[PDB]
Structures are given as structure tokens and as C-alpha cells.
Ligand binder design. Structure first.
Ligand SMILES: Cc1ccc(C(=O)NCCCCC[n+]2ccccc2/C=N/O)cc1[N+](=O)[O-]
Ligand SMILES: Cc1ccc(C(=O)NCCCCC[n+]2ccccc2/C=N/O)cc1[N+](=O)[O-]
Ligand SMILES: *[C@@H]1O[C@H](CO)[C@@H](O)[C@H](O)[C@H]1NC(C)=O
Ligand SMILES: *[C@@H]1O[C@H](CO)[C@@H](O)[C@H](O)[C@H]1NC(C)=O
Lengths: 535, 532
């Protein structure tokens, strides 16, 4: 040492770190980027649970984002910001188990509530280094300690031969769990309070958050949870052991491969070869289905998330959950004929019928017809605008909105304090077309406070709006209650209960309270369809 | 004698009676025989034309009511008694009634023929609510109503047998229609402009005349109030009719010739005693002896006939009341009664759906419960009670009416649809039943125009407007006044725009889609369900 900024030097269990002083619009923050929390899961460690990182010597430089976990890179619209904002922004590698820490500058004197972000990406993609996950605004404006981790995705994170020693499945979730243990042991060195840790995540990250609620060893590592547009229940977040084994065995043959010999051969393949065949193992033509996701192993997940939310005790739990207004629209362009970002995507009745089969790929013919009859407007059954919007609603309701409504309802009934929202504001900077409405994932930039960066060209009201949301999320992190304790003047956010089913609209206007999360429609998906399934 | 009261029809002379209506006199000819009495060896047989008679036949009085079950649910309660027979019961009951203006019309006048309801087990053309004097006096119409055999005597069928071929009660109606063709010009009626109208079982009868070729040369327009030939209560298969008749015969102590011979020896009340005991399931809105798909009067199911028919030169007026189902819940569904607000639990609501959709499987009844539950108030008594009524009215009336209107409009017919939304100031049923089945009839027939029944001034003005819709439809096949040039007009129902009108105290309002989403459930989804 000697001439470095003494506020950027910090020791953790593994050794000494040097962080970087970043500028936020309102002042400096401290960032510690690319902290390794596991041994590199490479070579003979591919598909294995993570091992804790062994101490290093000297001062590790923690001023850069580290590698992104090896993953599929989306090529649907090459050069388009709407797609590439999600793509990896650092080199791809299997050596990718690193985490990031943002704190106030100087670091806080009293211990400060910790927010831990778990990114989404369908369990096949994602990185904690993306611009929309930038912790500097929450750290500067709300004084939060923010932690985000990389976790293995795709085959490297979730390929499972259930019951094997060499590929037990869910190691991507164990990566996240190891980072949670790293926070417990080390975050006090940054001024963070290990006894006040809130998990929040979006989509597959939200499902991940839900899995930690449901997995007993993770429960001692956090105290509150936010689930944005995703759930551990629902039709895409888990597979059975049987289906996971079928998908892993098919991927093995597609790349040229007793479970030990199979996994051993898979470990000899280049990472890119596995990624090149990941999408080829899905049982049906589908959207909103991902090849390698958490498996119901009877270990991390002692049973299906359905069984666990329906029965478990949650009296100690405080959860914030919500959806965007148009959950489904984004996904139609990845497989439903007739949908494009470049047209209005007005579709015919025939294309709606074919789309329902692709967006509800596990549905029998009778179930599909039930869906079509429910979502058809029988005063205008052939109107292309209603059919396009109905296709988006089918996909959003089946995959996100109704799994969330079920989760909120079971959690509230079984002792949890639940707060629910619908996010209804479309960013003025959105590059996706207008028919997509408020698409999946486009509340994240407001939670993290990107509008406060003047160079990103958001409106003044969007900055005020972002600050409202940062206050809601951090108040909840701090107290289990998103409401401002000193501000009773503003309209209040009531908890979701089974009796009143209250939630709030999040938009440019003051909080408005609404009742029922798609109550009629979600009864169709959550109560009727499963009973139809049993026939 | 009064020459206006003396008429010669093909069978001989008749003497009618001058009756007072609020605005003047009417000529009424009550109790005109149109068939040989279907008694003795003629029971269950097709009707035969009435033999000529000598002298002047006295037609100043309503004739006997066809033998039928009499309702005892609420003894002495007007809301039920108003439907009970108001003349003596007899198997000798095939008589019709004619009202005309006094003096007799100078020009041939459009004819309206009323076919009463009563679930094909009851009913009479002599009920006070079917009084034709107001339409005759105010609109100058010639009004005809007939008695037809109900219950076992009209619809007991051993299909394919010679002596109980089925549907004889519908043949009774058809013979009265031929009587109108042959004789109505003598009253000043125009046989080239005959409009059938009927309510519930009567509307389903009207619809069965639309679907049976020999009936079609006997009328030109049709009105179907709260009833349809299609749907789940109005017809039975040949096999189910055979089962029900064989069971009734076992219950009273009896190949088909011998079985029907023994049934013919049974006193009428012996047959009625067991009428309600042959239904396959505990139910409401189900009736033991109704028209049968014989392959003769009905060449096929009403469903297949409305689906494939040619209806181009046909005009039809169809509609429903606001609360079709509420009336029937008190006849079987536990927790419903005239005398309290019938606030039911959710368990009672599930139990009620098995009774109100008695042909539904476990899965189908589950679909119904989940569809009609308000999942924001899933346990609230008021919502469950109102949903129970909705299930029954939608399943049995509203969605069959929407299916029929849609098939008719798409296949050439001219259709006008309505929903009747005014609850009579004088109603004796409780408030929770709303606007019940059958309580639009008194307005169309014009009873509010009688001051002694203590209707309100608005209801009298309302009745006059309805009388004008119905008779304008009779005159032209279009209910709109060709003199009134003020909007809104009543538009035709079509498949594209699905327009219908609300009938109430306020002016006509035009609405689109007749419970479109819910009737898609009943008419499109549920059939694919039960059948797999
Ligand atoms: C070959 C292929 C490629 C992609 C798919 C597919 O279904 N893609 C959908 C997911 C991309 C979303 C990016 N994202 C990640 C995290 C958070 C938000 C967002 C977006 N905000 O809304 C499917 C296939 N395939 O089926 O072959
Ligand atoms: C033993 C019995 C008796 C009657 C029923 C049953 O379902 N009755 C229906 C209504 C009959 C009278 C009303 N009515 C009749 C003609 C025209 C209009 C109206 C008014 N409607 O609002 C059912 C049973 N049973 O279940 O056994
Ligand atoms: C939009 O674009 C896609 C692909 O280019 C096409 O298949 C679809 O039919 C288009 N839609 C319209 C409404 O032109
Ligand atoms: C913001 O607006 C300015 C206006 O000159 C433009 O030059 C800049 O590229 C814009 N930046 C973004 C991120 O939209």
C-alpha cells in the first residue's frame, strides 16, 4: 500500500481486495468487482457442485467485471439494443464464479441492509455485469450495500443425471448459495449487515429466489425476498428427474457420448459444442421453455415447488412479488409465426390457434381448445389486433402472471406477509415496438435507478419514478414493508391477502390499489387446467 | 242475436260473445273444437279432425284444460297458482279460442297464434295472462290460442309403434294451425299472414314447427320467448323416450301393442301420479314427457336441423328475460325458497350445479363451478345464489337462444333479438328472483291496460309499446314502427355484430353480444368435454 485510496482496501476471508471509486450522479460509490467466491468450475469440476475459493496471496485487483459464464448468445436481431442489452458484455468462460459489491463512499459507519441480486436469463444466460444491473445508484442514493453474483447457466449449471455423483443437478443454484454464504461471512467487512439480507431477482432469477425460500439450507442466509416476474412454481422453472435425465442423455448423443462414463465424455467436450446443441433437446416446439433448468432432485428441492408452496410454513417470511403489464409480448418473436419486432404482428385466427400450441406446448388438444375458447373475444373472434394481444396474454398468463398469483395466494394463506404489484410504465427509451406494451424485464432499469443518469435521456418524471421505486425496494429490504414510515400522506401499499387480494399499480401516477391478480383467468390456469390434465 | 257474434266455419255455426276491453268491445269465440276428443282408444294417438256439427255451437266459454299435473309447491300462492288450470281437467280438451275486433275486421287481418308453455307437462290457453282481448282491441289483431295435450297424453312415445308414435301434442298444435288456414278468413283473419308466438315449452314448440316441413306451409313468421327447440330439455332421443314410457308402465302395473293397451285402461290421474318418477337424474328444468326425435315430425335432432337448415324466407323474433333461472331453483335446489333471500353457501352451490346440470360429468360440473364463481368473492352468499340462477338460466334458455339466433341468422333468416329487463310492480315472487321466467307475457298481451290490476302508468305505456313491437313484427316481419322516424331502431341480429335490444321502461337501447363469452363455454367447450 502507500498511496492508494485507503477507502478501497478491504480484507475478506480469502485475502485482500482493491476496489474502485465510481462516480454516480450524486457522488462517489465504492465498487468491488470480480471477487472470486468459488474454485473455477473447470475441467474435472464441470457439472460439479462449487468448492469454496481457496485464499489468494497479495492484493487481488477488484476493479473490473470478471468473465461471464459460458452461455448461448442471442442472435435474433443482430445489432439491436433491445436484444444486445441482455447479451454478455465480458468474455465467456467456464471460469466465471465471481461476485460484485457496491457500497456507499465512504463505507457506512453502522451496519447497513444488504441487497443481493440474482439475474434472470431462462437459466441459460445472464451476467451480473450487465448495465441494467448497475448497483451504483442504489448504493449512492439509498445507501444500500448491493451484491450480485455470477452463477453457472445452461448445461454447465443445470445438466443433471439425477442420482449420479458427477452431475447431481442444480449446481447453478449451489453457486448462488455459496455466494450467499460468502455474504454471510464477509459482508460486514464492507459495512453490510449480514443479519439483514434481502434477495431480489427477475424471471429465472426470481425463480431462483423462490428456490432458496423452498430449500432449507438457504433459509438461514437471507431474511426477505423480492420476486420480479418469475416464480419457482409454474411450467418452465423446473423439470422432473426423469425429464432432466432424458435431456442430458440426448445432449450427450448429440455431441457424441453407466453415468460415470457418459459424464466423463461430456467433460472432454469443448464448452462451445455443448452450447451449440442446448436448444435441440426440448420435447416440443415451444416458446418460454429452456433446456437446462433446476431439477426436482429430492435434495435441493425435496419435492416439486408446487407441493412445497402448497404445504410449507412461511409465517416468518416477507415477500414482494409482481409482474409487468405485458409479460408475454417479448417471447412471441422467438418462435410464434406471425410475430416480429419489425411489424405490428397482426395475426389471423389460424396463426393464433397454431401459436397457442407453441406457447402452451404441454397442452393436449382439449386443453389447447379450452385456452383458445377462454382467450377468444367472441364479439370479434377474427380481429387481428385482439388475436395478437390474446396470444401475448396467453403466454404471459400461463408462464408468469398466474404462477405469481398462485405463489402470492399460497404464501399469504400460509403465514407470509406478501406485497404485490403490477408494473405498468413503458420506458420512453424502449427500443421494442409499441405493440409489445410494457414488456418483460423493462422494470429492472427503474428499480436500479438508471433514469438518474442524465446521459441516458430519460424524462424528469421517470427519474422521480425511479426514485420512488428505489425507495419501495430498499424500504422493504430495511423493514419488510415498502411503505415510507414517515410518509402517511402518500397512498399506502397494503399487503396481499387471500380475502382482499390487494396489489398496487406502479406507474407515473400515485399508488393505486387494485383487487385480484387476473382472478378469473388465473382460476382457469391454476384450478381448471390441472383438473383437465388428469383426464 | 248479434250478427257479429255468429260465424260459420267448415264444421258448422258458432256463436261467440262480445267482451269488454278498456277501449271498446271485442268478439271472442271460446272453446271451438278442432279435433275429435282424444279419449279411449285415441289416447296417445295422433289427433283427428272434428266432425261437423248441427245447429249453432255455443262458443262463449273456455273449454276444459288438458289433463295435467297441478302444482302444489306453494298452495294458494298467486305466483304459482296463476299457472295452474283455471278450468276443469279433461282428456277431452282439444279446443281453440279466437279473439277479433268488434265489429269484425273489414280487411283480412294478420293472425297471431299463441302456443302456451308449461314444460310440455302443463298449461292452458284459458289462463288470465293469455287473454287476447287487449291485442285484438288495441292493435286490431286476430288472436288464436289452442289447447294441446301435455304430459303422458301428449308426448308418451313408444317410438316406431303404431299406437304411441310420439309427438301427438305437437300434432295437436299443427291441426289447430290447419284449422286456422281453413277457417280464419271467416273471422276476418288473413291466412296468408300467420305469426306463431309462444313462451318456454311453447317457444320450443314454435321452433319445432320451424324445423318440421309439414308445419311450414301453415305460418309465415315466428316468435320464440325464452325457449328453443334445441337445448337440453325440449327433446329426448327415441331410446330415452322408450325407457321413460316403459318405466311409467311398470310403475302403474303394465311388445308395445299390449303395453299401450293396458296404459289406455288407466284413469288419467294414475298416469300423472308417476309422471315425475321416470327422470334419470335428480334435476330441475327437466320434464318427463317432451317431444321425441322420432325421425318423422323431427327428421333429426334439433341441433342437426338448425345446423343444416335453409331459413332464407323466414323472419324470427327471439329473446330472454333478465333472470331466466331464478324461478326453477325453488323446485329442487336445496337452500332456495320463495320466503327468504336464499343466500347459499359454496357447498350448496356445488351441490346445486349437479342438479341444475344433471347430465354433466364430474369434470364438466367442475368447469361450470369454476366459470361461474366470482374469484374475487368466491364464498359470498349473494354471489353464489345469483350464480346458481345464472347457471340454470344460461344452460337451459340464454345459450340455447343464442345458438339458435346465430344459426338462423347465418343461414338466411331474419332475426330480431331482445332481453326483457323490467320487473312487474305487481310481482309476488321475492326480489332476489329479479325478472323471472314468464313475467314478460303479461306485458305483451297487454294486461297493464286493465286499470283494476293496479299496474303503474309507466307499465301501461310500456305494455303498449311491446304490443306494437309484436304486432308490427306480425304485420311485416319487422318490429319497428314504419311511422316512428326517431332513433334508435331495433336492428336485426347478425353473426357479425350480434345486436339485440333491452326491453324496459327506458327507450330501446342496442347491445352487442348475447352473453357471448359464457355461451361460448356452453355452446363450444362443454360439448367437446363431455364427449371425451
Ligand atoms: C434459439 C433460441 C433463442 C432464444 C429463445 C428464447 O426463448 N429466448 C427468450 C429469452 C431472452 C430474454 C433476455 N432477457 C434475459 C434476462 C432478463 C430479461 C430478458 C429480456 N427481457 O424481456 C429460444 C430459442 N429456441 O427456441 O430455439
Ligand atoms: C314436481 C315438479 C313441479 C314443477 C317442476 C318445474 O320445474 N316447474 C317449472 C315451472 C312451472 C310453472 C311456471 N310456469 C309455467 C308455464 C309458463 C310460465 C311459468 C312461469 N315460469 O316462471 C319440477 C317438479 N319436479 O322437480 O318434480
Ligand atoms: C411481420 O414479420 C414476420 C417476419 O418477417 C412475418 O412472418 C409476419 O407475417 C409479419 N406480420 C405482418 C403483420 O406483416
Ligand atoms: C441522448 O441525446 C443526445 C442529444 O444530442 C444524443 O446525442 C445522445 O446520443 C443520446 N443518448 C442516448 C443514450 O440516447
Amino acid at each position: 500500500e502507500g498511496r492508494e485510496d485507503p477507502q478501497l482496501l478491504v480484507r475478506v476471508r480469502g485475502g485482500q481486495l482493491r476496489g474502485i471509486r465510481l462516480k454516480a450522479p450524486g457522488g462517489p460509490v465504492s465498487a468491488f468487482l470480480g471477487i472470486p467466491f468459488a474454485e473455477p468450475p473447470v475441467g474435472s469440476r464441470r457439472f460439479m457442485p462449487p468448492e469454496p475459493k481457496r485464499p489468494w496471496s497479495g492484493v487481488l485487483d477488484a476493479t473490473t467485471f470478471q468473465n461471464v459464464c459460458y452461455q448461448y448468445v442471442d442472435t435474433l436481431y443482430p445489432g439491436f439494443e433491445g436484444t444486445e442489452m441482455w447479451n454478455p458484455n465480458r468474455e465467456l468462460s467456464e471460469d466465471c464464479l465471481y461476485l460484485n459489491v457496491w457500497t456507499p463512499y465512504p463505507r457506512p459507519a453502522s451496519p447497513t441492509p444488504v441487497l443481493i441480486w440474482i439475474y434472470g436469463g431462462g437459466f441459460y444466460s445472464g451476467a451480473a455485469s450487465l448495465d441494467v444491473y448497475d448497483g451504483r445508484f442504489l448504493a449512492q442514493v439509498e445507501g444500500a450495500v448491493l451484491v450480485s453474483m455470477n452463477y453457472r447457466v445452461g448445461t454447465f449449471g443445470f445438466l443433471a443425471l439425477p442420482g449420479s455423483r458427477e452431475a447431481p443437478g442444480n449446481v447453478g443454484l449451489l453457486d448462488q448459495r455459496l455466494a450467499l454464504q460468502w455474504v454471510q461471512e464477509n459482508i460486514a467487512a464492507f459495512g453490510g449487515d449480514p443479519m439483514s439480507v434481502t434477495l431480489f431477482g427477475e424471471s429465472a432469477g426470481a425463480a431462483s429466489v423462490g428456490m432458496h425460500i423452498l430449500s432449507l439450507p438457504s433459509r438461514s442466509l437471507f431474511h426477505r425476498a423480492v420476486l420480479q416476474s418469475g416464480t419457482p412454481n409454474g411450467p418452465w422453472a423446473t423439470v422432473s428427474a426423469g425429464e432432466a435425465r432424458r435431456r442430458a442423455t440426448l445432449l450427450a448423443r448429440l455431441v457424441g457420448c453407466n453415468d460415470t462414463e457418459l459424464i466423463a465424455c461430456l467433460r472432454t467436450r469443448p464448452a462451445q459444442d455443448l452450447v451449440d446443441h442446448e436448444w435441440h433437446v426440448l420435447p416440443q416446439e415451444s416458446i418460454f421453455r429452456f433446456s437446462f433448468v433446476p431439477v426436482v432432485d429430492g435434495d435441493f428441492l425435496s419435492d416439486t415447488p408446487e407441493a412445497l408452496i402448497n404445504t410449507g410454513d412461511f409465517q416468518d417470511l416477507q415477500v414482494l412479488v409482481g409482474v409487468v403489464k405485458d409479460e408475454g409480448s417479448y417471447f412471441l418473436v422467438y418462435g410464434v409465426p406471425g410475430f416480429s419486432k419489425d411489424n405490428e404482428s397482426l395475426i389471423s385466427r389460424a396463426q393464433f390457434l397454431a401459436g397457442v400450441r407453441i406457447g402452451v406446448p404441454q397442452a393436449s388438444d382439449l386443453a389447447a381448445e379450452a385456452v383458445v375458447l377462454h382467450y377468444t373475444d367472441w364479439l370479434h373472434p377474427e380481429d387481428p389486433t385482439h388475436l395478437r394481444d390474446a396470444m401475448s396474454a396467453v403466454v404471459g398468463d400461463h408462464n408468469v402472471v398466474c404462477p405469481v398469483a398462485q405463489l402470492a395466494g399460497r404464501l399469504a394463506a400460509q403465514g407470509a406477509r406478501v406485497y404485490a404489484y403490477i408494473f405498468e410504465h413503458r420506458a420512453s427509451t424502449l427500443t421494442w415496438p409499441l405493440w409489445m406494451g410494457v414488456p418483460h424485464g423493462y422494470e429492472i432499469e427503474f428499480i436500479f435507478g438508471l433514469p438518474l443518469d442524465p446521459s441516458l435521456n430519460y424524462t424528469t418524471e421517470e427519474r422521480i419514478f425511479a426514485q420512488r421505486l428505489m425507495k419501495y425496494w430498499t424500504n422493504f429490504a430495511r423493514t419488510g414493508d415498502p411503505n415510507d414510515p414517515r410518509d402517511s400522506k402518500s397512498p399506502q401499499w397494503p399487503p396481499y391477502t387471500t380475502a382482499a387480494q390487494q396489489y398496487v399499480s406502479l406507474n407515473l401516477k400515485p399508488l393505486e390499489v387494485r383487487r385480484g391478480l387476473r382472478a378469473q383467468t388465473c382460476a382457469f390456469w391454476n384450478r381448471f387446467l390441472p383438473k383437465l390434465l388428469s383426464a
